Amino acid sequence: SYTVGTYLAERLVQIGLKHHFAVAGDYNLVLLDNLLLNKNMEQVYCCNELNCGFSAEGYARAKGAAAAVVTYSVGALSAFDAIGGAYAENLPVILISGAPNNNDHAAGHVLHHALGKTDYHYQLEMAKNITAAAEAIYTPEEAPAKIDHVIKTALREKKPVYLEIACNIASMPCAAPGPASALFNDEASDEASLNAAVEETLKFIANRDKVAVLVGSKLRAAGAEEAAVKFADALGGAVATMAAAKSFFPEENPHYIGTSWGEVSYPGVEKTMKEADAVIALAPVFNDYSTTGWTDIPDPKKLVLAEPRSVVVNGIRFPSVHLKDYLTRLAQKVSKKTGALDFFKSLNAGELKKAAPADPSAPLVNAEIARQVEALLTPNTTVIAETGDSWFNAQRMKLPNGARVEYEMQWGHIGWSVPAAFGYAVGAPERRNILMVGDGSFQLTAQEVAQMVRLKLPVIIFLINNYGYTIEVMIHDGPYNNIKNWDYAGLMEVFNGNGGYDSGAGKGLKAKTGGELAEAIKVALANTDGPTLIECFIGREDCTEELVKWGKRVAAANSRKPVNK
Amino acid sequence: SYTVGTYLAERLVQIGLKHHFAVAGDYNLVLLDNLLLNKNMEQVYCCNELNCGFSAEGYARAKGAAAAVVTYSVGALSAFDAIGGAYAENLPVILISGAPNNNDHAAGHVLHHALGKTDYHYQLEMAKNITAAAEAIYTPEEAPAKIDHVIKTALREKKPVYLEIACNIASMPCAAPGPASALFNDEASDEASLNAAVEETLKFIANRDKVAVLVGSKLRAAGAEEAAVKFADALGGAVATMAAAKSFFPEENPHYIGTSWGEVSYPGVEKTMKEADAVIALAPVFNDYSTTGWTDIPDPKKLVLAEPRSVVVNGIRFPSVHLKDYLTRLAQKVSKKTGALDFFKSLNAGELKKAAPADPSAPLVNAEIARQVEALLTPNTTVIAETGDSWFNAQRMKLPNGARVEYEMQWGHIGWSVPAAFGYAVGAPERRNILMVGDGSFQLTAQEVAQMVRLKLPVIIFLINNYGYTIEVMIHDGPYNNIKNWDYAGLMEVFNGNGGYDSGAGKGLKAKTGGELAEAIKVALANTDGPTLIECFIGREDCTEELVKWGKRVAAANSRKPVNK
Amino acid sequence: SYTVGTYLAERLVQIGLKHHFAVAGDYNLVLLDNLLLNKNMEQVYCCNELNCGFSAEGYARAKGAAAAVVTYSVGALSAFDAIGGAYAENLPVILISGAPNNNDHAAGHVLHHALGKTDYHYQLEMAKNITAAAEAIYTPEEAPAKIDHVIKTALREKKPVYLEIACNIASMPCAAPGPASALFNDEASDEASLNAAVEETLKFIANRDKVAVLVGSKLRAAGAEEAAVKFADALGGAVATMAAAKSFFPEENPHYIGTSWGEVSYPGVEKTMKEADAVIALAPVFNDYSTTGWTDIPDPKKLVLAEPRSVVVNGIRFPSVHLKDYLTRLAQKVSKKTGALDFFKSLNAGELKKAAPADPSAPLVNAEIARQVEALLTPNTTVIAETGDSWFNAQRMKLPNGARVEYEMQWGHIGWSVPAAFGYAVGAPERRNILMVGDGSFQLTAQEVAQMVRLKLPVIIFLINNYGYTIEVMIHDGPYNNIKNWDYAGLMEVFNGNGGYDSGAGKGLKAKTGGELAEAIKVALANTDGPTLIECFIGREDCTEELVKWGKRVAAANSRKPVNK
Ligand SMILES: Cc1ncc(Cn2nnc(CCOP(=O)(O)OP(=O)(O)O)c2C)c(N)n1
């Protein structure tokens, strides 16, 4: 029959996992044994628990959900940083922690890995702050209900959840799981509300010809990407993406006008958004970074706010309306409103201005790196872009339909990108997976490249070595922005360990000119047996113009004086 | 248009409230003003906040949902006792607290009604422990989403929720509410799971002829009372109710065999449950009181566990199956299984043995009170039965179909019954409303009878004066079970205040014999202008036989020694 | 030897309790039995748990500390309102709750009085928000350390604490308590900091001749009342009390100039505080009520802030300086600074203007009640003054040295005064105990008068019946300020229950003229066998001039618009 552990394994298989991530500890060893009994998924090991959490996060971007398994306290508390990140980025990651023997509660027992006191609910109480559901399982009979509850909640809310399992019950018998379909069961839109929300939208734009569509970073969480295309094509209006929504709308679409990001928007976009009579915002997140330090906030008078599960339009709030349904129904009813797109074209603002191919022997510059990476983009490519100037370089790239960009702009934990690229590549081995990561970020989580070597994943890593924290320099400079340099290219042979207990086929190369970069890229594409790290050397101040402007607005918002209370 | 306050009022009207309960305080006065603008419900005032909360709880039993409005800290903290009670009893009560001016956060300001520190999230953090959803509203723009969220959650989960509203935003503009239908929008059962759960049940009872049905205290929360009757009639098996499920199944139904409550069950019931091959438990709560101190736990081998949103049967767990749907579908497919009912009849155990009419002039005894109250039961009657021997007296009463009994057996807060009877009578004025309450319990919340006088509610109160805490005496006796006696009958004229600033038509009578009780009852029935309290005098040890047996098992469970860890 | 329960009892006796307050419930019965074994204190029973908590609070005002014992969940949650109150008012009240059998943790058991789930740490987690220490005791071996910890913390911090005790361990053996002296052991002031704080104060006032002293509501918590007199006599400056500090400084002292409370100060006080060169504030609490809606905040430039355990003076913060030590040392070193007192006298502002004796047959008015109550004040009297216009009537009374006034102005829970007067009278039976309480407040907690009857306590209660909530009327008026009137005088015979199971010697009288009031007062003073309630009839708008002015400022502060963020 089933055990607590194999019940969990079966539910994970049912939601579509082909892998879960783990770091062993004595409170979870028996649990890991049970998970291993299900041959329909592989157990993937990580260097540390923060990286384990972020690997699961990256996997969820590839597959829709993920799971990480850690040990009590010492494992879970660092993983909480990654789980908070999954909550911020709307990804259903299931964190499972091993926990004390169930005899140790209310017993006056002090246990290892804990605070030295005799109670053990602190971890659960902490977890409640950063999850959509959090349950502790102390007896086998209680496991099925708690497992089903957190998994259903994760998938529905698109948020992470927490489970802890007493170490001595992992192999104990419990009931068997029913059909997978039950886990995805969700409300349909309220019919009356859906129709009313659509009708009020039509009323709102009846005499507003210049309609612009703003695509936001929760569109994928709403499962509404395809519906957004149907709507945009029916409307015939202008479509822009917010920075964190890069690749959530097809850029080869004739309605697409580029990035909307205040004073760092694509040419003509800022002016078009300003002149629009109505802005239909699809699942947006307006925060201090996306509004460019609160300088770019949509006019409440013009706004149709279509969130994942509700629409606010014409002064009325309609809960219980799913965005996918709203967009589909609206596309069927809406008439052509080309005003904003016509206006955009009338500006003749031209395309984003990009650098021409550099002299191959000249010292490498930022724009030349960005140019060569952009030339690698295919419909089958995903770029993982780290917090730092890499945000801005990726934002400038023209994507062929199908190409994806992954951003972590709400949480913004430097170092996320390395483990996330690992997890994503495990989940999407068929894709050309490219990681753009700065030297500062790389140092936080660098060891996860060794797992890429281990699993023979052909991730191409562009390590941008400008000797320090350039994004921070552009916000507020000080001695804390300087770091210790490493020989990053040489790190690959360290992780290979050829001649040691095992081996690896990773490659590390240096690029100090455009010619060297082109040669390194040829080698990277040909290396199908492991990751390739290309260490690119550029100057601290050689960064995007966009970063400079944005950083000034961010610094100003952060430092504004207290107001009179 | 709408304000934060009138938005809340409209949503409350949309879920079916015709009243809300309140106690004024400076942090909620403007909010109360806004609530008053909606003429489709009345604002009802209470003596104190604990009573306010329990009045809302009683109203929710009559109407399906309720709301109470209190002031910050001094109001909310006592109301939390009642909200905990609503959570325990599965009632959607919305607690709304006024809160500090929104300028006072992060300002280093110490405010009245608070702890003397300068932060004000402690009340919200406390509330999270005893609600299904809890939101603080600090700005008007955030109100609609938070209000909709908590209300939808309350109705779906059948649990209470918490809202706090900054005092200076109550009258500020916000969006208007959409259609009421959105608030009730819920998942349908998963089709595959529903069919599978029904099929597995049929398989389970295929070769188990003696099938008994056990009706539990969450059947009403599941909305499954009518479906339970359809299923029982199709099955033809024996049906028993758990103590707290009294009146959740029609007692004039021919399959009904009475109360199942371990050694204090109706005649023949204990033996029938024991002999059953299969027990279908419909939304049960098995706790230390309902299992008679853990002496009466259903055999896991025979159990079909049909919870409100899941079924566990034949070793398989099926989430996402609504009980109402399961019972309806099962009724259509199930064949006759009369084994347990035939067995019950074969016992010839007879009816519950009840006392004959007493000599009218003899000193009043417990059984004679119970006899005369039982004779008042009609299809249009509701009995509110307080924690104490009243639990056991009510349990012994034969209910005509339509008659209701209200119990608070999970929370079990003495004094609940007085404010709950008030709230219920406000919600169901058309019914004959009877309160059975002990002298000990009455002292905790007695002042709410004055509100019954004020609103001219013809509640009939049987105050059982046995001079102390008899239920506790029967668990573990000591000096703490003795109380100060009052002239309870005389309290009515005090609450009337005739000759004072206002007036009242309440009546208070004493009964020391069966004849005096009968006369008092005649007066009570004829008093349509206010409550009638009948003070019944009986001895401390003159209590049900059931209470004595049950109390011993409870004491034993509570005191059992720690086990080796 | 000792048990968990008798250890607790002994520690309570050691801190000076002669009584503790309790409400029985099955989770605490065995604990109550153990407490009863210690014959050096009496166990006092209450009607309900909110009242139980407030009785302990009142007792702590009389004796310095107190304890209340309640049952799990249903008892504790309401008591939390009173405990929050003790925290706000700086009183060491120990709340002890019974709790589940220690076998029921991590067992998947649902228990009565709880939420219906299988974990039981929610109550402890809630309690942490409103206490200085909170411990759960699950095993006997852990009890002594946890009991000693919370008691030491309560006494040191002058704040309430929380203990819960598993019901099945109350009678189990544990270690014996050491000497009582250990419980009071506290830090001495840091010598260098004490001397430096005194020297900096002398430097600060060296060239500031007009020095005023402002006595604050934490002076008693600091144990610094006697030291304040020594300092004031040495300084020779003007001394005013904040509203909540009434009676914390002797009013027959020649340096005392009356109440400082913004625009509702005594004559000449506001102007004297404004003209002072330096204000030495002794343990103040500046909140929205004490600053009269933020209209009366001390000038930071002139302020010497002497808190209970730190001094801020001349721009320097000195932690680890006890107020009593600071004042004593300062009194030895300080020279005469009579400037502010001379200035006050030069104003010739005269005494507070009070009404002359009324015509005995004329309709009773507020000022005439206040006049007759004031005439009852002796060096042996304590007045308990409820939130409402009673705050303002008490504030106007001239106190003979030794007379006390008790206020609850930080928490401000209406109804506090009835149970607090009960607890105080239990703790200080030797005093003339007077309760001034409004009709609105009296309704929240009226049943505790029955305990005064039971224990034969000669409390004199002036019940001011102006038919509704006058203090709220003066803040913001609406229908929520109207209440149901009772025959309050008649309530006394109800609580006596003469002719019933027991008896009582309480008396209830009505007063509608000054002559009737004088006669009722004669009777009250002669009634030594029970409480006397005098129901005084006056008009809604017949209130102090001070209340009217203050209420307008309070309303304005509460309603001020949000500021731009
Ligand atoms: C876990 C965590 N700690 C600190 C930060 C602050 N932070 N944000 N960006 C940075 C610097 C990133 O530097 P690099 O990766 O070298 O990228 P560049 O800005 O292109 O040089 C920091 C230190 C952060 N975002 N996350």
Ligand SMILES: Cc1ncc(Cn2nnc(CCOP(=O)(O)OP(=O)(O)O)c2C)c(N)n1
């Ligand atoms: C708020 C709260 N505090 C204490 C308890 C414990 N308790 N349970 N039943 C009782 C006594 C009930 O007394 P009565 O209402 O006079 O009922 P009888 O048993 O018929 O005498 C108590 C004190 C409780 N159940 N709820």
Ligand SMILES: Cc1ncc(Cn2nnc(CCOP(=O)(O)OP(=O)(O)O)c2C)c(N)n1
């Ligand atoms: C537990 C609690 N609930 C509500 C409040 C708000 N409040 N403050 N004062 C009052 C009215 C006081 O009425 P009374 O005692 O009749 O006093 P008067 O102002 O003399 O009429 C209220 C309703 C409060 N202070 N405490």
Ligand SMILES: [F-]
């Ligand atoms: F471990």
Ligand SMILES: [F-]
């Ligand atoms: F208030």
Ligand SMILES: [F-]
């Ligand atoms: F209890």
Ligand SMILES: [Mg+2]
């Ligand atoms: Mg860098």
Ligand SMILES: [Mg+2]
């Ligand atoms: Mg009784």
Ligand SMILES: [Mg+2]
């Ligand atoms: Mg009043």
